[PDB]
Amino acid sequence: SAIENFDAHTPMMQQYLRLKAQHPEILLFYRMGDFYELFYDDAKRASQLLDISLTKRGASAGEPIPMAGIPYHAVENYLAKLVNQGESVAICEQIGDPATSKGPVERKVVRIVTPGTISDEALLQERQDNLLAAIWQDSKGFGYATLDISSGRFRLSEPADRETMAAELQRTNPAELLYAEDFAEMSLIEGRRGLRRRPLWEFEIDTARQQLNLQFGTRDLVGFGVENAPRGLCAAGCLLQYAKDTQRTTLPHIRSITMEREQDSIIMDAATRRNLEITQNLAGGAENTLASVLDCTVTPMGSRMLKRWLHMPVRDTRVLLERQQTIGALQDFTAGLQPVLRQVGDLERILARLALRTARPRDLARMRHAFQQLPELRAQLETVDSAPVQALREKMGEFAELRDLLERAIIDTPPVLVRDGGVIASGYNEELDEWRALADGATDYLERLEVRERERTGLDTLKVGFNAVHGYYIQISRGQSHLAPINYMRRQTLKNAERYIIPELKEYEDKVLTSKGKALALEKQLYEELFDLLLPHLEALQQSASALAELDVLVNLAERAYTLNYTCPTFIDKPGIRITEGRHPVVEQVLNEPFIANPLNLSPQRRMLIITGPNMGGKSTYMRQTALIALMAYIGSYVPAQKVEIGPIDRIFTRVFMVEMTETANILHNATEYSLVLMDEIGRGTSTYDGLSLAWACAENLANKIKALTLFATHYFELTQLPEKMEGVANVHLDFMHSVQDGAASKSYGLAVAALAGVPKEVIKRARQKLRELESIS
Amino acid sequence: EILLFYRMGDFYELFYDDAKRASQLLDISAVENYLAKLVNQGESVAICEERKVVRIVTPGTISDEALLQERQDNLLAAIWQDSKGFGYATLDISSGRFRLSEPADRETMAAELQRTNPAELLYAEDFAEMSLIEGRRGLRRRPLWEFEIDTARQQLNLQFGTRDLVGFGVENAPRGLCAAGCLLQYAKDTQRTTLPHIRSITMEREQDSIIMDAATRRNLEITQNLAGGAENTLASVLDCTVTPMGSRMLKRWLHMPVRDTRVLLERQQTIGALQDFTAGLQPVLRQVGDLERILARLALRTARPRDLARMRHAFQQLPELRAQLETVDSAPVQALREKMGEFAELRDLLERAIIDTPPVLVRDGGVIASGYNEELDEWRALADGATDYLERLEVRERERTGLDTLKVGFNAVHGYYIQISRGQSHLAPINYMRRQTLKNAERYIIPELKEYEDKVLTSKGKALALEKQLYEELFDLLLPHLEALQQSASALAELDVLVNLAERAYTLNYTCPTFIDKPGIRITEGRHPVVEQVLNEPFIANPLNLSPQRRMLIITGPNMGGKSTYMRQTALIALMAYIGSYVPAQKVEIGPIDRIFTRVGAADDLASGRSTFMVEMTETANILHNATEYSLVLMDEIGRGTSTYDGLSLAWACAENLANKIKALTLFATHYFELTQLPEKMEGVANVHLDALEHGDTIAFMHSVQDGAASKSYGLAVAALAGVPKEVIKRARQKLRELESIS
DNA sequence: AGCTGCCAGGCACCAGTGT
DNA sequence: ACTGGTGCTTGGCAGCT
């Protein structure tokens, strides 16, 4: 094995290796003219991942270099491939002109494509958030931060325990997760997509505070309410540095940061989120979820917002009551607003590409199309009687000048890129129109030159054409080649044809090519000028898009409440849930059968229901719908019931061997009289009574000590004695029965199921006999 | 409805629902890569290349290496329902193994599907039991006329070259024949070639094998773990076969334990005999490869040069294998040695006919070796003659002109040419006729160059045509021996399976089980063949003593998988004994076993709204209805999932029935102490248990089976470890005493 | 409409004219 | 040091059919 030496490498590889040294662990697209190339292991790994060929490059001194590459113009196709596989990619471009450059051309990494920092439409998921996130652990606790780089929505939290930290990850579901080398709880993180093991120095608190205050243009972060969250700031700092390092542009759209403090929302553990299937069914998909029923939003940003709302039920009554008002007010105007709102589209993500200076002509056209809907929406919303709605109407904005600007500046349906020109509309720039008229002037001249020359020569096959390689030409067929005029200079030969050039033709070639080149250059300059004109209003536009997205969510939840017959829940002082004709919002929609509605009456005096009765999904649905009604009430939506009075709820536990006892312990430790606890048939014991013993003791603890609002489904008939012994406990039972009755389950229903299951009549009779023997002694 | 790949230039496009369904299945927003994806998911695909469909690949009828799964069977199957019962048929189109059955009830029909697991399932429009088939891959709703009996008998007798099917032992089975007919027509319709490799058909009779229901197959994880994959299965441990066909055979064996003692004893003999020669045979056997599937592509006339090269390579191993196996003392082994064959002429034929490492296709030629055909060699020499002339023409013309950039090249469009660079274009000779101009170069032609172009192109064309003819000639020469070759591949595959099971027995320390007259199982130092391998901890071996006098064991104690493993390993030992393999134990005496029932593991609902507890009681009912004194019954903690007394009452009544009425060999795991009274009341019942050691800060669930009932309850101990408040545990400990002391 | 194969623009390389 | 050929990934499409 030979000894490598940087001085022995060719200037190109010297340049490459110096750049690659800055990105050892990730793939580097070193630009070489029209191709983005890769070398050594990068080439080997790329050829496997991207399904491209692996070749070599010569070196007279040394061994040949593994090579692989792709044309620059098809880069987005391959970035998509790598990003879906969780691979980061460094984009190294050519800076400086090879004509002027003596050695290899100067080459900087201009950006780094990574799963959590993508802002391109083609790589992103329309109705799904894509979050970069950072996670930090301390001797005192955890520190978390997330960033939607396409909206600049930057948040921060400081979970106390891993149970809350696991819930954060479940809820937020980051696409790329930064973490410290010294992270203790790898179990939380291991086997996650987009893992990024960062060095411990990036989570420095003094740099984080410095770097965040720099970004936000503040001297202290007291205003953002994150000043006393150092664990969070350490994560936020690490994240912001990464975000910057990958984009390598200024990130103006990241204006603020927010503490998400647990007391402000209804806490839900990871299991409880999955059991309630809020945005994700138990099988993994999105069908038959609460979101699948509620989300009929017309814009992607609205869809994404509503999903965030569902996972973060707010506890702030002022916010809740304002949503209810807005929902009631907008019910008559849903048909009117929604068609117009639809035309605004995903303005949120368009503005990110504006902020990053990556917005393509279609983005600005869609942005222009969105501005055109604004006067219409303002007209509709003026008559709506709500302070919340009028606030949104105000925040929504009008942007008349910008609407006008883009109407003038860009054509009706522009191309996908500016690269080839044709984006800018005529009349916007006088210099540009002149250059285009010169190009079309030479176009005309050349057309009349064709008919002139074929007349003048008398050769019917005589044509005028253009070749990218050889320029303009006069083509004559093989048969008539000999009759070409003296002044025709042959420029190209084909099998059945000959092509010539004359000074007149060459003169207007130079005319049209310089004209087009001049125009193309001017479009690109005029296009970058639009960014300088629009970006001064970015904060106002970001607010508009936020108003428009929230307006979509509320108009949607207004429409859903009507179309699905929901009612407005009332809030009460004391803990309790009082549902009349309650329904499961998803099950009633997926089943074509009519849903059997049911009541619920939980109060401080009636805390725990022991739900005996047969095995089936009726119990689970009764319990789950109770949670989903509470959840929906606390996102400010209407709820699937005839009437609902609901008191404060601090968190929802939805429990449905040791894994059972751990989850039960989690409930007993963290539950409080403001908690909604849903438990299904715990009591897995080594023997006959040890499961019952714990089932008893937990129920006992949940009723006397914790006093949580508990639905406690069980098969133990022994637990139907709890109301006799304890204050606050009561019996209900489901009697396809599907209707909740007061009192305990009437039959002993195990043998009945065994009969249905097909156990021999003889065997059931001997059980029925044995059952009497057991009951008569006890 | 089939997916359609409408070709649009360089892309195969799809539209409407096809596009929607494709984007989901294929993970799209290189065709053979995606066909493989769809075929494994049981999807048919139409290939549209005028503008019309040239090919349709169907998941159950594929025979191409690139689409198939090397070590996995791929079965087309047909299912028929009748007022009298069910009718089933399956076909491995790559081996021509065609079978037929007539399940009496849906329980047996479900087991067939589970076991066979077809890649593409044909069914009649009037199928009553959708539940059996709904949500399965490769569903194909066929019209009811394809299941006609008179056409089936006609079409089958045509295929097999018989007038009557009495010889195949399927003459009686009309339901099966209806399915078999529907299937054969489909098979033919999509290959649309003669299918010579389909030479027979076979009825399988339940009494000849150990019956296993679907649940029991999945709970024993014979070839498929509970999660769906193939890791941590009995097959994952036993299958260290060197050929794919051997792998696939062994998997079939595991799912079909034979009851025929003669067959079993013959396998045991073969296994014992071959133990010293495993190191020797396996490296050679490996080089035979998947001859089974190569012969299908021969039979279908789709075999590519590499197939025949691999077939030639396989024939070369045969004399070596025959030499090794001659000294082996077994009638069974010598029978395989005979059936294996030698095919000396065919080996020689392919050595002469095809080059060492041929191309992937014949399309471009270069497959046939020189010396095989005199006409071909002449045509090649003429081509190479003009090749030489043109090569010397290059150096001649560049010398004569003095132009160093002067080259001679070839273009499909323009033919041969003399290329000169832009810089030296003006110095081209007068006789050079320019016919193509490039950016930095010019290309010309002369009559001498055009003359030898016609010479080489006609020569090559003549040769290419002759190769393709000589290649198709090889099929005409090989195919007459297809039946003999199919038997060889069958012998080679079975030899691989037995050599493997010989090697596994040694490497994994298995022993030969003995068979006894009366029902029983007597294991010494028994082990779970998978768990002992997956766990890096030492496996605690355990005995078992089940007889007619000791039929049922009530297994109380803590179940933290220790009970399930003790029970599952008992089944897997019985299963392995009855595929003729050695078994994971110090010693095993085993009596006749008619059926294995395994009510173990927690049963996921499939048709929901019926609980977990009913799934247990359904499987329980299946046991009580169908079990017999020759049955091995494994039950895990039934009574669980419903009221304390209700559950105990059934648990009692089932055990009672299984000990007195059925008298099956039963392992009955339970948490009810009350059931530990059964040995006092009933003759053939006894108590065993597992326990846990407690010392200091250490608590360990032991895996050792002890005689007598369980002493203690470890539920509260686990709850303590899990972190349930000390106060809550104390109140449970209090409540537990109250419950136990009353009863 | 269906193929070949030329070309895109980096850069290093090799071979024929430069002391 | 110079000059004018060579090679190299994949995709676009001219130039043939």
JSON list of N, CA and C in Angstrom, two decimals, chain B residues 684-732:
[
{"chain": "B", "resi": 684, "resn": "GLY", "atom": "N", "xyz": [-54.83, -39.12, 34.54]},
{"chain": "B", "resi": 684, "resn": "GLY", "atom": "CA", "xyz": [-53.69, -38.85, 33.64]},
{"chain": "B", "resi": 684, "resn": "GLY", "atom": "C", "xyz": [-53.11, -37.44, 33.67]},
{"chain": "B", "resi": 685, "resn": "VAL", "atom": "N", "xyz": [-53.47, -36.66, 34.68]},
{"chain": "B", "resi": 685, "resn": "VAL", "atom": "CA", "xyz": [-53.03, -35.27, 34.79]},
{"chain": "B", "resi": 685, "resn": "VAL", "atom": "C", "xyz": [-51.95, -35.15, 35.87]},
{"chain": "B", "resi": 686, "resn": "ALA", "atom": "N", "xyz": [-51.01, -34.22, 35.67]},
{"chain": "B", "resi": 686, "resn": "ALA", "atom": "CA", "xyz": [-49.95, -33.96, 36.65]},
{"chain": "B", "resi": 686, "resn": "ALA", "atom": "C", "xyz": [-49.56, -32.49, 36.66]},
{"chain": "B", "resi": 687, "resn": "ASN", "atom": "N", "xyz": [-48.85, -32.08, 37.71]},
{"chain": "B", "resi": 687, "resn": "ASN", "atom": "CA", "xyz": [-48.39, -30.70, 37.87]},
{"chain": "B", "resi": 687, "resn": "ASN", "atom": "C", "xyz": [-46.90, -30.56, 37.62]},
{"chain": "B", "resi": 688, "resn": "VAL", "atom": "N", "xyz": [-46.53, -29.55, 36.84]},
{"chain": "B", "resi": 688, "resn": "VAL", "atom": "CA", "xyz": [-45.15, -29.10, 36.75]},
{"chain": "B", "resi": 688, "resn": "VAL", "atom": "C", "xyz": [-45.18, -27.59, 36.86]},
{"chain": "B", "resi": 689, "resn": "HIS", "atom": "N", "xyz": [-44.01, -26.99, 37.00]},
{"chain": "B", "resi": 689, "resn": "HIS", "atom": "CA", "xyz": [-43.93, -25.54, 37.09]},
{"chain": "B", "resi": 689, "resn": "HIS", "atom": "C", "xyz": [-42.55, -25.01, 36.81]},
{"chain": "B", "resi": 690, "resn": "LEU", "atom": "N", "xyz": [-42.52, -23.70, 36.56]},
{"chain": "B", "resi": 690, "resn": "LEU", "atom": "CA", "xyz": [-41.31, -22.92, 36.52]},
{"chain": "B", "resi": 690, "resn": "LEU", "atom": "C", "xyz": [-41.33, -22.05, 37.77]},
{"chain": "B", "resi": 691, "resn": "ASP", "atom": "N", "xyz": [-40.17, -21.53, 38.16]},
{"chain": "B", "resi": 691, "resn": "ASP", "atom": "CA", "xyz": [-40.09, -20.61, 39.30]},
{"chain": "B", "resi": 691, "resn": "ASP", "atom": "C", "xyz": [-39.04, -19.53, 39.06]},
{"chain": "B", "resi": 692, "resn": "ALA", "atom": "N", "xyz": [-38.80, -18.71, 40.08]},
{"chain": "B", "resi": 692, "resn": "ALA", "atom": "CA", "xyz": [-37.80, -17.66, 40.01]},
{"chain": "B", "resi": 692, "resn": "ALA", "atom": "C", "xyz": [-36.95, -17.62, 41.28]},
{"chain": "B", "resi": 693, "resn": "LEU", "atom": "N", "xyz": [-35.65, -17.43, 41.10]},
{"chain": "B", "resi": 693, "resn": "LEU", "atom": "CA", "xyz": [-34.73, -17.22, 42.23]},
{"chain": "B", "resi": 693, "resn": "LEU", "atom": "C", "xyz": [-34.77, -15.79, 42.72]},
{"chain": "B", "resi": 694, "resn": "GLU", "atom": "N", "xyz": [-34.81, -15.62, 44.04]},
{"chain": "B", "resi": 694, "resn": "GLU", "atom": "CA", "xyz": [-34.75, -14.30, 44.64]},
{"chain": "B", "resi": 694, "resn": "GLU", "atom": "C", "xyz": [-33.58, -14.24, 45.63]},
{"chain": "B", "resi": 695, "resn": "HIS", "atom": "N", "xyz": [-32.61, -13.39, 45.35]},
{"chain": "B", "resi": 695, "resn": "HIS", "atom": "CA", "xyz": [-31.63, -13.05, 46.37]},
{"chain": "B", "resi": 695, "resn": "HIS", "atom": "C", "xyz": [-31.22, -11.61, 46.21]},
{"chain": "B", "resi": 696, "resn": "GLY", "atom": "N", "xyz": [-31.03, -10.93, 47.34]},
{"chain": "B", "resi": 696, "resn": "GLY", "atom": "CA", "xyz": [-30.49, -9.57, 47.36]},
{"chain": "B", "resi": 696, "resn": "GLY", "atom": "C", "xyz": [-31.23, -8.64, 46.43]},
{"chain": "B", "resi": 697, "resn": "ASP", "atom": "N", "xyz": [-30.49, -8.01, 45.52]},
{"chain": "B", "resi": 697, "resn": "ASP", "atom": "CA", "xyz": [-31.03, -7.07, 44.55]},
{"chain": "B", "resi": 697, "resn": "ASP", "atom": "C", "xyz": [-31.26, -7.82, 43.23]},
{"chain": "B", "resi": 698, "resn": "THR", "atom": "N", "xyz": [-31.10, -9.14, 43.26]},
{"chain": "B", "resi": 698, "resn": "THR", "atom": "CA", "xyz": [-31.26, -9.93, 42.05]},
{"chain": "B", "resi": 698, "resn": "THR", "atom": "C", "xyz": [-32.55, -10.70, 42.05]},
{"chain": "B", "resi": 699, "resn": "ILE", "atom": "N", "xyz": [-33.30, -10.63, 40.96]},
{"chain": "B", "resi": 699, "resn": "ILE", "atom": "CA", "xyz": [-34.51, -11.45, 40.76]},
{"chain": "B", "resi": 699, "resn": "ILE", "atom": "C", "xyz": [-34.51, -12.08, 39.37]},
{"chain": "B", "resi": 700, "resn": "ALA", "atom": "N", "xyz": [-34.51, -13.40, 39.30]},
{"chain": "B", "resi": 700, "resn": "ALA", "atom": "CA", "xyz": [-34.36, -14.05, 38.00]},
{"chain": "B", "resi": 700, "resn": "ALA", "atom": "C", "xyz": [-35.43, -15.11, 37.73]},
{"chain": "B", "resi": 701, "resn": "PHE", "atom": "N", "xyz": [-36.06, -15.00, 36.56]},
{"chain": "B", "resi": 701, "resn": "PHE", "atom": "CA", "xyz": [-37.03, -15.97, 36.16]},
{"chain": "B", "resi": 701, "resn": "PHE", "atom": "C", "xyz": [-36.30, -17.14, 35.54]},
{"chain": "B", "resi": 702, "resn": "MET", "atom": "N", "xyz": [-36.31, -18.26, 36.26]},
{"chain": "B", "resi": 702, "resn": "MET", "atom": "CA", "xyz": [-35.63, -19.48, 35.83]},
{"chain": "B", "resi": 702, "resn": "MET", "atom": "C", "xyz": [-36.41, -20.17, 34.72]},
{"chain": "B", "resi": 703, "resn": "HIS", "atom": "N", "xyz": [-35.71, -20.94, 33.91]},
{"chain": "B", "resi": 703, "resn": "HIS", "atom": "CA", "xyz": [-36.33, -21.65, 32.79]},
{"chain": "B", "resi": 703, "resn": "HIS", "atom": "C", "xyz": [-36.37, -23.15, 33.00]},
{"chain": "B", "resi": 704, "resn": "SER", "atom": "N", "xyz": [-36.21, -23.59, 34.24]},
{"chain": "B", "resi": 704, "resn": "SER", "atom": "CA", "xyz": [-36.08, -25.00, 34.50]},
{"chain": "B", "resi": 704, "resn": "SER", "atom": "C", "xyz": [-37.41, -25.50, 34.98]},
{"chain": "B", "resi": 705, "resn": "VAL", "atom": "N", "xyz": [-37.92, -26.56, 34.36]},
{"chain": "B", "resi": 705, "resn": "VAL", "atom": "CA", "xyz": [-39.18, -27.19, 34.74]},
{"chain": "B", "resi": 705, "resn": "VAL", "atom": "C", "xyz": [-39.01, -28.15, 35.93]},
{"chain": "B", "resi": 706, "resn": "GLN", "atom": "N", "xyz": [-39.76, -27.89, 37.00]},
{"chain": "B", "resi": 706, "resn": "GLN", "atom": "CA", "xyz": [-39.73, -28.72, 38.21]},
{"chain": "B", "resi": 706, "resn": "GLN", "atom": "C", "xyz": [-41.04, -29.49, 38.34]},
{"chain": "B", "resi": 707, "resn": "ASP", "atom": "N", "xyz": [-41.01, -30.64, 39.00]},
{"chain": "B", "resi": 707, "resn": "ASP", "atom": "CA", "xyz": [-42.24, -31.39, 39.30]},
{"chain": "B", "resi": 707, "resn": "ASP", "atom": "C", "xyz": [-42.99, -30.68, 40.42]},
{"chain": "B", "resi": 708, "resn": "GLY", "atom": "N", "xyz": [-44.31, -30.88, 40.46]},
{"chain": "B", "resi": 708, "resn": "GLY", "atom": "CA", "xyz": [-45.16, -30.23, 41.45]},
{"chain": "B", "resi": 708, "resn": "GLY", "atom": "C", "xyz": [-45.67, -28.90, 40.96]},
{"chain": "B", "resi": 709, "resn": "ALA", "atom": "N", "xyz": [-46.62, -28.32, 41.69]},
{"chain": "B", "resi": 709, "resn": "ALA", "atom": "CA", "xyz": [-47.24, -27.05, 41.32]},
{"chain": "B", "resi": 709, "resn": "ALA", "atom": "C", "xyz": [-46.39, -25.86, 41.78]},
{"chain": "B", "resi": 710, "resn": "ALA", "atom": "N", "xyz": [-46.72, -24.67, 41.26]},
{"chain": "B", "resi": 710, "resn": "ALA", "atom": "CA", "xyz": [-46.04, -23.44, 41.64]},
{"chain": "B", "resi": 710, "resn": "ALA", "atom": "C", "xyz": [-46.40, -23.04, 43.08]},
{"chain": "B", "resi": 711, "resn": "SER", "atom": "N", "xyz": [-45.40, -22.59, 43.83]},
{"chain": "B", "resi": 711, "resn": "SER", "atom": "CA", "xyz": [-45.59, -22.16, 45.22]},
{"chain": "B", "resi": 711, "resn": "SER", "atom": "C", "xyz": [-46.09, -20.72, 45.31]},
{"chain": "B", "resi": 712, "resn": "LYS", "atom": "N", "xyz": [-45.44, -19.82, 44.56]},
{"chain": "B", "resi": 712, "resn": "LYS", "atom": "CA", "xyz": [-45.56, -18.36, 44.72]},
{"chain": "B", "resi": 712, "resn": "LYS", "atom": "C", "xyz": [-46.14, -17.59, 43.52]},
{"chain": "B", "resi": 713, "resn": "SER", "atom": "N", "xyz": [-46.53, -16.33, 43.75]},
{"chain": "B", "resi": 713, "resn": "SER", "atom": "CA", "xyz": [-47.01, -15.44, 42.69]},
{"chain": "B", "resi": 713, "resn": "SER", "atom": "C", "xyz": [-46.07, -14.23, 42.54]},
{"chain": "B", "resi": 714, "resn": "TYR", "atom": "N", "xyz": [-45.47, -14.07, 41.37]},
{"chain": "B", "resi": 714, "resn": "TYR", "atom": "CA", "xyz": [-44.48, -13.00, 41.11]},
{"chain": "B", "resi": 714, "resn": "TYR", "atom": "C", "xyz": [-45.02, -11.76, 40.37]},
{"chain": "B", "resi": 715, "resn": "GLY", "atom": "N", "xyz": [-46.34, -11.56, 40.36]},
{"chain": "B", "resi": 715, "resn": "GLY", "atom": "CA", "xyz": [-46.94, -10.42, 39.67]},
{"chain": "B", "resi": 715, "resn": "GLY", "atom": "C", "xyz": [-46.62, -9.11, 40.33]},
{"chain": "B", "resi": 716, "resn": "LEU", "atom": "N", "xyz": [-46.69, -9.08, 41.66]},
{"chain": "B", "resi": 716, "resn": "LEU", "atom": "CA", "xyz": [-46.41, -7.87, 42.43]},
{"chain": "B", "resi": 716, "resn": "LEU", "atom": "C", "xyz": [-44.93, -7.53, 42.42]},
{"chain": "B", "resi": 717, "resn": "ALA", "atom": "N", "xyz": [-44.08, -8.56, 42.37]},
{"chain": "B", "resi": 717, "resn": "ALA", "atom": "CA", "xyz": [-42.64, -8.36, 42.25]},
{"chain": "B", "resi": 717, "resn": "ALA", "atom": "C", "xyz": [-42.29, -7.60, 40.97]},
{"chain": "B", "resi": 718, "resn": "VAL", "atom": "N", "xyz": [-42.91, -7.98, 39.86]},
{"chain": "B", "resi": 718, "resn": "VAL", "atom": "CA", "xyz": [-42.70, -7.31, 38.58]},
{"chain": "B", "resi": 718, "resn": "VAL", "atom": "C", "xyz": [-43.20, -5.87, 38.63]},
{"chain": "B", "resi": 719, "resn": "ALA", "atom": "N", "xyz": [-44.36, -5.67, 39.25]},
{"chain": "B", "resi": 719, "resn": "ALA", "atom": "CA", "xyz": [-44.94, -4.34, 39.43]},
{"chain": "B", "resi": 719, "resn": "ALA", "atom": "C", "xyz": [-44.04, -3.44, 40.28]},
{"chain": "B", "resi": 720, "resn": "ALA", "atom": "N", "xyz": [-43.36, -4.02, 41.26]},
{"chain": "B", "resi": 720, "resn": "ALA", "atom": "CA", "xyz": [-42.36, -3.29, 42.03]},
{"chain": "B", "resi": 720, "resn": "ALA", "atom": "C", "xyz": [-41.20, -2.85, 41.12]},
{"chain": "B", "resi": 721, "resn": "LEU", "atom": "N", "xyz": [-40.63, -3.80, 40.39]},
{"chain": "B", "resi": 721, "resn": "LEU", "atom": "CA", "xyz": [-39.57, -3.50, 39.43]},
{"chain": "B", "resi": 721, "resn": "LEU", "atom": "C", "xyz": [-39.98, -2.46, 38.40]},
{"chain": "B", "resi": 722, "resn": "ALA", "atom": "N", "xyz": [-41.21, -2.57, 37.90]},
{"chain": "B", "resi": 722, "resn": "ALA", "atom": "CA", "xyz": [-41.74, -1.66, 36.89]},
{"chain": "B", "resi": 722, "resn": "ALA", "atom": "C", "xyz": [-41.90, -0.23, 37.41]},
{"chain": "B", "resi": 723, "resn": "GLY", "atom": "N", "xyz": [-41.94, -0.08, 38.73]},
{"chain": "B", "resi": 723, "resn": "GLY", "atom": "CA", "xyz": [-41.93, 1.24, 39.35]},
{"chain": "B", "resi": 723, "resn": "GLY", "atom": "C", "xyz": [-43.26, 1.70, 39.89]},
{"chain": "B", "resi": 724, "resn": "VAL", "atom": "N", "xyz": [-44.14, 0.75, 40.19]},
{"chain": "B", "resi": 724, "resn": "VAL", "atom": "CA", "xyz": [-45.42, 1.08, 40.80]},
{"chain": "B", "resi": 724, "resn": "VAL", "atom": "C", "xyz": [-45.14, 1.51, 42.23]},
{"chain": "B", "resi": 725, "resn": "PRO", "atom": "N", "xyz": [-45.69, 2.66, 42.67]},
{"chain": "B", "resi": 725, "resn": "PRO", "atom": "CA", "xyz": [-45.47, 3.17, 44.02]},
{"chain": "B", "resi": 725, "resn": "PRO", "atom": "C", "xyz": [-45.51, 2.10, 45.12]},
{"chain": "B", "resi": 726, "resn": "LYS", "atom": "N", "xyz": [-44.58, 2.19, 46.06]},
{"chain": "B", "resi": 726, "resn": "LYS", "atom": "CA", "xyz": [-44.49, 1.23, 47.18]},
{"chain": "B", "resi": 726, "resn": "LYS", "atom": "C", "xyz": [-45.81, 1.13, 47.93]},
{"chain": "B", "resi": 727, "resn": "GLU", "atom": "N", "xyz": [-46.49, 2.27, 48.07]},
{"chain": "B", "resi": 727, "resn": "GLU", "atom": "CA", "xyz": [-47.79, 2.32, 48.75]},
{"chain": "B", "resi": 727, "resn": "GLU", "atom": "C", "xyz": [-48.82, 1.44, 48.03]},
{"chain": "B", "resi": 728, "resn": "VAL", "atom": "N", "xyz": [-48.83, 1.52, 46.70]},
{"chain": "B", "resi": 728, "resn": "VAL", "atom": "CA", "xyz": [-49.80, 0.79, 45.87]},
{"chain": "B", "resi": 728, "resn": "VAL", "atom": "C", "xyz": [-49.53, -0.72, 45.89]},
{"chain": "B", "resi": 729, "resn": "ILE", "atom": "N", "xyz": [-48.26, -1.10, 45.88]},
{"chain": "B", "resi": 729, "resn": "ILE", "atom": "CA", "xyz": [-47.87, -2.51, 45.97]},
{"chain": "B", "resi": 729, "resn": "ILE", "atom": "C", "xyz": [-48.29, -3.09, 47.32]},
{"chain": "B", "resi": 730, "resn": "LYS", "atom": "N", "xyz": [-48.11, -2.31, 48.38]},
{"chain": "B", "resi": 730, "resn": "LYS", "atom": "CA", "xyz": [-48.46, -2.77, 49.71]},
{"chain": "B", "resi": 730, "resn": "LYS", "atom": "C", "xyz": [-49.96, -3.03, 49.83]},
{"chain": "B", "resi": 731, "resn": "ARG", "atom": "N", "xyz": [-50.76, -2.17, 49.20]},
{"chain": "B", "resi": 731, "resn": "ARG", "atom": "CA", "xyz": [-52.22, -2.33, 49.21]},
{"chain": "B", "resi": 731, "resn": "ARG", "atom": "C", "xyz": [-52.65, -3.52, 48.35]},
{"chain": "B", "resi": 732, "resn": "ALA", "atom": "N", "xyz": [-51.88, -3.81, 47.31]},
{"chain": "B", "resi": 732, "resn": "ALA", "atom": "CA", "xyz": [-52.12, -5.00, 46.50]},
{"chain": "B", "resi": 732, "resn": "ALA", "atom": "C", "xyz": [-51.75, -6.25, 47.30]}
]
